[PDB]
Amino acid sequence: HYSRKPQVSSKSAKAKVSDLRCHFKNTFETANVINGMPLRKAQQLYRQVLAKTRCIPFKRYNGKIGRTAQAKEWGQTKGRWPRKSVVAMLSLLKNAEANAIEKGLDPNKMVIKHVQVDQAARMRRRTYRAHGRITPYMCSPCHVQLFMTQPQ
RNA sequence: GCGUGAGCGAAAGUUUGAAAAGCACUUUGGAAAGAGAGUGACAUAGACCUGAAGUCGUGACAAUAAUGGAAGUACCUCCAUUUCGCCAAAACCAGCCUCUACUGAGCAAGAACGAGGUCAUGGUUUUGGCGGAAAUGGGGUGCCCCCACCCGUCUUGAAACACGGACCAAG
RNA sequence: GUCAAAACUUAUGGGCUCACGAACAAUGGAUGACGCUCAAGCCCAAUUAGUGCCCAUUAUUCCUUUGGUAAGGGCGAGAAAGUGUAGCCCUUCCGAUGUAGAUGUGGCGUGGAGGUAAGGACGAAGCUGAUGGCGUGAGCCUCAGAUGGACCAGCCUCUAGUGCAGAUCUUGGUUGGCGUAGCAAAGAUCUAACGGAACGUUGGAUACUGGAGCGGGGAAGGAUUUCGUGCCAACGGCACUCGUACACGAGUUGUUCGGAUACUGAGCACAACGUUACACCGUUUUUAGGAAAAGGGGCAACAGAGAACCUGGGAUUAUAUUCCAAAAAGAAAUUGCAUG
RNA sequence: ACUGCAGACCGUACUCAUCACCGCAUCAGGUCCCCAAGCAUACAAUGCUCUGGUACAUAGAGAAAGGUACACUCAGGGAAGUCGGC
RNA sequence: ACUAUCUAGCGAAACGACAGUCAAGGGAACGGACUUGAAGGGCUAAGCGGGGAAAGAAGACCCUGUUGAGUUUGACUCCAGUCUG
RNA sequence: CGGCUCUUCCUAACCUAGCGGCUAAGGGUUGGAUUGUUCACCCACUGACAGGGAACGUGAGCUGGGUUUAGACCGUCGUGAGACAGGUUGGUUUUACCCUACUUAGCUGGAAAUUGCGAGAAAAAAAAAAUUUUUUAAAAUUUUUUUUUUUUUUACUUGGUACGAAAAAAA
RNA sequence: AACGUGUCGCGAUGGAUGACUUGGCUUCCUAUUUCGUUGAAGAACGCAGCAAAGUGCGAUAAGUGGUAUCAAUUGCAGA
RNA sequence: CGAAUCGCCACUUCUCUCGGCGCCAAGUACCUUCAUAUUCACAAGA
RNA sequence: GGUAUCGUGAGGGUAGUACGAGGUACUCCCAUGCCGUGCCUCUGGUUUCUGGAGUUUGUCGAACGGCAAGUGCUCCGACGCUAUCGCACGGUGGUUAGCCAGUCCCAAGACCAGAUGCCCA
RNA sequence: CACGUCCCUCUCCAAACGAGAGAACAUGCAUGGGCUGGCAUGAGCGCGUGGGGCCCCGAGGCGCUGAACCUUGAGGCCUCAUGCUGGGACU
Ligand SMILES: [Mg+2]
Ligand SMILES: [Mg+2]
Ligand SMILES: [Mg+2]
Ligand SMILES: [Mg+2]
Ligand SMILES: [Mg+2]
Ligand SMILES: [Mg+2]
Ligand SMILES: [Mg+2]
Ligand SMILES: [Mg+2]
Ligand SMILES: [Mg+2]
Ligand SMILES: [Mg+2]
Ligand SMILES: [Mg+2]
Ligand SMILES: [Mg+2]
Ligand SMILES: [Mg+2]
Ligand SMILES: [Mg+2]
Ligand SMILES: [Mg+2]
Ligand SMILES: [Mg+2]
Ligand SMILES: [Mg+2]
Ligand SMILES: [Mg+2]
Ligand SMILES: [Mg+2]
Ligand SMILES: [Mg+2]
Ligand SMILES: [Mg+2]
Ligand SMILES: [Mg+2]
Ligand SMILES: [Mg+2]
Ligand SMILES: [Mg+2]
Ligand SMILES: [Mg+2]
Ligand SMILES: [Mg+2]
Ligand SMILES: [Mg+2]
Ligand SMILES: [Mg+2]
Ligand SMILES: [Mg+2]
Ligand SMILES: [Mg+2]
Ligand SMILES: [Mg+2]
Ligand SMILES: [Mg+2]
Ligand SMILES: [Mg+2]
Ligand SMILES: [Mg+2]
Ligand SMILES: [Mg+2]
Ligand SMILES: [Mg+2]
């Protein structure tokens, strides 16, 4: 299961989505933004990044990705606005505020403590390239898991 | 499965567990799924023994061509051993090392006295320092100074602007 | 002189030198660099001065190893008559590089076997390892697994499908490049309403195809793609609520359509006969008695020849020149037999 | 003439194509036949239009350089370009 | 006008020893690794095409091999066919 | 091969410049006809139409005329297939999205060049104005007085800021 | 700082390894052992209450009959 | 926050061709504290 | 320590050139070419302001208004972009034409104890 | 948390994207007007080839009519007139 056990089981909510069918590299970016954030400011960052009001700071999986001015917030020039990945993150954060609520915990004091998008087993599909070749297409679905303690 | 055809022709261990007891029920989700709960000795045994490498994610940590060698040192050591002996320093002995004669003032020239050095030399302890820790060793990470042309290859000659060389596993 | 160890730029040495000087034409730039000029240059000599120092895998010496088919001694725990081990012990001496290659090895390690000895559910193998320890080394051993779940190490002997970074090696997996290159051919969608968890549906708008059509039927080919309901996990290189996808259930109706029954054609080939080591060949009639009640049998055209049917339907989710029911919606033609 | 009975077999869905066939594919390639409107026009050229069909070809924002084009325009000169009016 | 550019979705390939600033030098005789100098904070985005003797394919050139195949022939050795007896 | 394109470097200097052949690499060194060309030769201009290097600079820049495989023609050679550095004609020019260079374009660190606390300033060495002298809170922490700024009731380009006033707050 | 690098702890991807092995390979043997026009081998199509494949079978169709054997088959159902 | 460093100064701290002092009594008189910090060991002190 | 502003300028780049005429055989003039740095008033070019007009075929029943012809086509056409096809400009000092410095261009990884504004929980 | 920076938003002397310049309740944006330009005389009604039986049909023409329209938008002018008017991030 979780790479890191929550410090205080009763005070934290865990959530996860295995074989999430969003790009790993985009979801890798999208979930890492959240890793220290309070859940409401993380619900927010996504609602705002879903509006093209703010960007997810792509960091590791930059590549020749385009420069944006909304990335200044994050300390670098490159940034990006996944939607499929931002929605899955909200949809996994709903999962935990639900998990957090049942524990009697208060979702709006709750803080993201551990986000970890592992890359999942990949799905094959086929190209059909120039001179009779057939190279791979492969989605790179991510395993995202997280928990969110609220402070004591 | 492939080929008009003659023909070619795979991969695949359902090896979960003793048994299916194969996760009822609650909870969020449109769902997939998730969080609890439950079964079982174990579910990081969940349709699955083991569970490597490589690769990746994450946390913490040290940090600032690569690798590499040598030697230290900084920090860390889930390591070893030892001590309730370890680090030192001085001495003694041994070893070892260093530091007249002739000639017409010179040499082609010989020892002596004295003193010093030293254990990465041998034997003799002494004296202090340290003693949940200390101590020596190993390991790890960084640095420092220094050394250091990618390997395999055929070739007189390879660092070659010569060939082969992305990674790992099995063979 | 610095880099660079050493003349912290030594000489209480000689000369020489002003501009260069320090063994084997074109990217800017090379006494190695700087810089040096009573030199840090050159010739000469020197070593503290008329009273040296620095650096080797070298030498010497010391320690250790290894080898010697080298020289001796010996036989608190040990003392083995020994090539070789954890070497029987001690002493002394000499050697040590090395490609191709040769050889040694009580050398390492693997699967298996004959033995021996032992271990394991108080956890075997395997795997993990700032687990140390041992060994020159191949490696072994221990520790720890918050690893595993049932086998198995030692030792001597036997055996081999026995040791892998490299073969543009094989096979599997993974990777950087990289969220990149792209997904830019055929002009196009817009709107509201509804649906839905969130692209479809309808209306409107707008274009397009432009009758050699993103039209309506067929052949070949395909063979369920058809249709409806559902579905959208996967696939539909974006998305889908939709699909030629998935699942389930349906669906193709003939006296007359086409085909065969029933033509011949380019052709083919059974039979027979012949040839061939052999029929899996050839002629296509057979030296041949082919009639069963002059030239054997057959096949070969879904575009040739042949060929009795038309419409209407309020008849389907899907078929109709095929379905319709007694007023056959009906109207025909046609074949066979039979009937007045 | 009539009437009576009988009239058997197999095909039959769908496709026929920038997604149903062949091309490893829903591949800009290929693949026989038939029907085929109106206007301009000499017309089956071309353009456009009723019918029948489409709106499927991933989309968005904006409009660096360099490109592609079944896109143009260019003063004065007029082949001097180039191997060659390509 | 479509690309490119930036975005949402989706998403390869080639290539890949390792890398990757230069000048001189030497050197397998044109270094990214070596010697000596000179630079160089790191990471980026779009271009670009100089270099990486960039990639492509065990040079189609050439030579070698007691290797092939095609063709030729009054090469050697033959074999059908033909004709003659 | 050549050209084109672009840059660059050299000089046994063509022009220009200075001299009196010398120095001088600065900047410049033309457009055309023929031919693939280079080269040469021509025409015209020009101050002049200099010579070279840069992998005989420069094909993932192009072009593909030369060279140019297969097709074919001719001459010669060959018995022939075929040969000819003889002629003729026709004859796919692939890939950057890597690294560096470069070109623009951003971001961020950094002075023990990320550390040490490892400490160096092109600084000054009671203050200001005319080295010395004079002026700038006082009196018993709080109170009073003075000065400056903000708000309210002429000179600046001319709307809005300054000095005027008066009051309040701060030093 | 960031990225990137590196160590460690977890986790994912991956499927090695080890154990397993109703399989293969090889050797050997045995016998009342050798198809078919009495329709063979092969091919086709079918048959189960739910059955695609595989197996079994052949419109008597996962079987009829004889024999032995026994109380099952077993996914569900069914006797 | 434990650190390494171990002379100062307006007598050098101008120029152009034995600086002073400090080193254990603020002084040359040894008045006078020093131990066990037990013979080196970062000076245990600035 | 932030943030902001004005600057410094080590270092690097670096460019002007040629011809002619006049004037008197230097100075001094005056044009031009090339180069370079810009700019777009004018002039030219460019139009997807499809601006306005005209116009062809199809089309909207017709006029109007359109619309389609992948911008239908023709004329004019602003903005803008741009042209030696327009226009403006191209500076010194010091040393031995060179060369260096400057002007000119980038300029603190040249880490600027330069200045400055604001806040420094 | 201060000051403030940034994003979102608006503008463009900027611009591939970042960056830039600005704005930050502002004639800022929006329409409208006026202007400057462009084109070139709209719709609509009210001399003429001939033609048809005083009118009708008539391309073209005339008049209202330098009209009509367009004129800032990748971003002409005018305040002329009316209209509409902060959140987030960070330290
Ligand atoms: Mg790009
Ligand atoms: Mg980009
Ligand atoms: Mg193909
Ligand atoms: Mg497992
Ligand atoms: Mg050789
Ligand atoms: Mg030295
Ligand atoms: Mg040896
Ligand atoms: Mg074996
Ligand atoms: Mg390790
Ligand atoms: Mg083997
Ligand atoms: Mg892209
Ligand atoms: Mg049309
Ligand atoms: Mg359907
Ligand atoms: Mg199906
Ligand atoms: Mg015939
Ligand atoms: Mg027939
Ligand atoms: Mg027919
Ligand atoms: Mg028929
Ligand atoms: Mg139908
Ligand atoms: Mg049909
Ligand atoms: Mg058709
Ligand atoms: Mg037509
Ligand atoms: Mg046509
Ligand atoms: Mg022209
Ligand atoms: Mg010409
Ligand atoms: Mg010419
Ligand atoms: Mg020419
Ligand atoms: Mg070869
Ligand atoms: Mg030979
Ligand atoms: Mg042979
Ligand atoms: Mg060349
Ligand atoms: Mg090149
Ligand atoms: Mg610092
Ligand atoms: Mg079956
Ligand atoms: Mg101390
Ligand atoms: Mg505006």
Token pair of A82 as six digits: 């996944």
Token pair of A118 as six digits: 């592992």
DSSP state of A74: G
* Integer Cα distance of A78 and A67 in angstroms: 5
Partners of A23 in the β-ladder? A141
Q: What number of residues does chain A have?
A: 152
Residue A138 sits at the vertex; the CA angle it makes with A136 and A141, to the nearest 5 degrees, is: 170
Partners of A113 in the β-ladder? none
d(CA A52, ligand 9 centre) in Å = 45
Q: Is A41 annotated for ligand binding?
A: no
Closest CA to A37 of A116, A92, A115, A94: A115
Q: State whether the beta carbon of A48 lies below 7 angstroms from any atom of strand J.
A: yes
Whether A18 contacts A95, CB under 8 Å? no
Q: Is A15 exposed, middle or buried (0-12, 13-18, 19+ CB in 10 A)?
A: buried
Q: For residue A42, which phi and psi values (nearest 5 degrees)?
A: -95, -30
PDB experimental method: cryo-EM
Closest CA to A85 of A142, A18, A148, A2: A142
Closest CA to A145 of A21, A19, A11: A19
d(CA A40, ligand 35 centre) in Å = 55
- Please name the residues in contact with A27: beta carbons below 8 A apart, sequence gap of 6 or more: A20, A82, A85, A88, A89, A117, A142, A144
Q: Which resolution in angstroms does this entry have?
A: 2.5
* Integer Cα distance of A85 and A69 in angstroms: 20
Token pair of A88 as six digits: 């899955």
* Window A83-142, strand D contacts by Cβ < 7 Å: 128, 132-134
DSSP state of A63: S
d(CA A152, ligand 8 centre) in Å = 64
